[PDB]
Design a protein around this nucleic acid. Sequence first.
DNA 1: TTTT
Length: 66
Amino acid sequence: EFTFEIEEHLLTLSENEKGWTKEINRVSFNGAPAKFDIRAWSPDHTKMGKGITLSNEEFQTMVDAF
DNA sequence: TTTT
């Protein structure tokens, strides 16, 4: 058992020939408070690809650093 | 090529 919900779309970074997009979103996993999520997504966003989840703290650390 |  596992669930996901894209709560907010922040940025699309690129799209490939199959229409999958790399995105920065706020995503809730298993109904938890949403985290930052940098991940590939199928065209209708019904299939997840490879990516990483970052807490607000981890994301701000990254932003401050670059 | 693709699932926390």
